[PDB]
Structure 1
């Protein structure tokens, strides 16, 4: 059948997110474009239904798309959400694998706000990477704002009613993306709010430099590769990552790395820290982004870029 969930016509496949089977589509009642993620209906570790509830739990938060349907349709499981634009990894590539300091600050404060409101709903994200932060669609209100998708790695970190934190714990299996994950993750420690923020600091330097110094390491196995990346993260001072860059990014990474395990990070203080970079450089926080100058001032386009 060309239509799932009663109302959603399946369209072009876009197969992001685990190669994890995503299509674009349209709501046949109101023309609203949607993203449709299928998932094999029987699985050991099915994430689609708790991902649906995660979107509902975060419903109304800015930068988090609506979920309109989760259901059946025979062979798979379906989740329908708002359709968004390219990822920050995509735009990073099209901009030459380098973001200006201005673009990094502006995207950083929106990412900090996104993660904060995930944390405010008693969840840690635990899969921070530029591939899961998406901009909006062209000619939309939110075309160039950052959004957050894919909550398959999310976990409750405090009880919602009592607000009491999960116990600290160790010897957890290392999974996530090794390029960005916190040092604590490398050591098998239970993740918490600070670890989402340390991962963000890694992305910030990734954007600013074009590369992180623990990229391109090799080992016989994956486990040993993860260990070498973790070793590099701990012998590279934040001040050397930020050689030639505004020192507020080194102070950011240093401070979130030293946060206590259950501590509530000072999100607004971190945002003011990064905002001060623009003041030291005489720039304004006006929403102008590097990718908005792509292709003569038209921005990203499918024929030329991807």
Structure 2
């Protein structure tokens, strides 16, 4: 797509592409463009199906003013959901592409991870809390993410200290108009998600519900703290991963307590996974209890620490 190509979204706002960075470009509004881009445009084929799933999520859930009301009521410094500005179709060389105009963000956490994709314990716990805030909000709004992992956490651009959950490509409306999906194992559609982190429900082909996002976040924090998960050697074998995950949850808390090196306790992560595994399929997580598990002293959250000293 040429720099300067002008996109018109469904609301009739016009967007001029910048430089590429699927395909993702800097973007500016035609009307009152700032020096510096605060928007990006994500582009994919119209048939491109994950972008459409994303569009549904963002259009339904990422309402700037609703988030603003939530942040204020819940006393959050921020919520790690990127803002959504518009969507539409554009044509280039005979084909029609769907695009979404999104808040500009910075670097993904996979890139800025230390030794063997690890973060300092304080950073792990804070990331967990920030994600619980996102989960509570999207869950309240009938959606689950299904794919929390470092590559889908991005730091802000305009605010580089804030962390954002992105890529709602596997997001799922689990409770459309308050009707919670039924539990059904589909043995034709098992083992979806990122195999390293996906939930047992996903392994069994069960429609994602709230507990699955909490479970996945638990696997993530264990991976971020300890540096590799018990199934590291099994990733090309989904069944074996399922088995390893089953055993880990079945043998909590010790499965997790034992895994940790002498430095970094998994006490918080163990109890987190205990809480997560206690949930019924249609059950609402105790997000406040979970946040407290990760922040036992109730410290204010401060800068994320990505330092690498000595490695």
Q: TM-score, normalised by structure 2?
A: 0.80
Q: Which runs of 5+ in 2 are unaligned?
A: 9-13, 68-78
For 1:35, which of 35, 40, 61 is the aligned residue?
Answer: 40
Q: Which piece of structure 1 moves more, 235-244 or 186-195?
A: 235-244
| 1:206 partner SS | helix
Q: Is the 8 A contact 1:133 1:146 kept in 2?
A: yes
Using the TM superposition, give the Cα deviation of residue 133 of structure 1 relative to its aligned residue in structure 2, in angstroms.
1.6
Q: Is the 8 A contact 2:172 2:208 kept in 1?
A: no
What residue is the counterpart of 1:199 in the other structure? 216
What residue is the counterpart of 2:72 in the other structure? none
What residue is the counterpart of 2:193 in the other structure? 176
Q: Which runs of 5+ in 1 are unaligned?
A: 15-19, 296-306
For 1:24, which of 23, 26, 30 is the aligned residue?
Answer: 26
What residue is the counterpart of 1:231 in the other structure? 243
Q: Distance in 1 between matches of 2:110 and 2:53?
A: 26
Q: Distance in 1 between matches of 2:240 and 2:308?
A: 36
What residue is the counterpart of 2:58 in the other structure? 55
**Is 1:106 paired with 2:123?**
no
Using the TM superposition, give the Cα deviation of residue 27 of structure 1 relative to its aligned residue in structure 2, in angstroms.
3.2
What residue is the counterpart of 1:71 in the other structure? 88
Q: Is the 8 A contact 1:27 1:33 kept in 2?
A: no
Q: Which piece of structure 1 moves more, 22-31 or 169-178?
A: 22-31
1:284 to 1:50, Cα distance in 2 relative to 1, 3 A: closer
Q: Distance in 2 between matches of 1:49 and 1:202?
A: 27
Q: TM-score, normalised by structure 1?
A: 0.81
Q: Distance in 2 between matches of 1:234 and 1:173?
A: 15
What residue is the counterpart of 2:18 in the other structure? 11
What residue is the counterpart of 1:255 in the other structure? 275
Report the aligned-residue RMSD.
2.2
Q: Is the 8 A contact 1:106 1:285 kept in 2?
A: no
* Structure with greater strand share of residues: 2
| 1:111 partner SS | helix
Q: Is the 8 A contact 2:53 2:171 kept in 1?
A: no
For 2:302, which of 276, 284, 287 is the aligned residue?
Answer: 287
Q: Distance in 1 between matches of 2:116 and 2:50?
A: 34
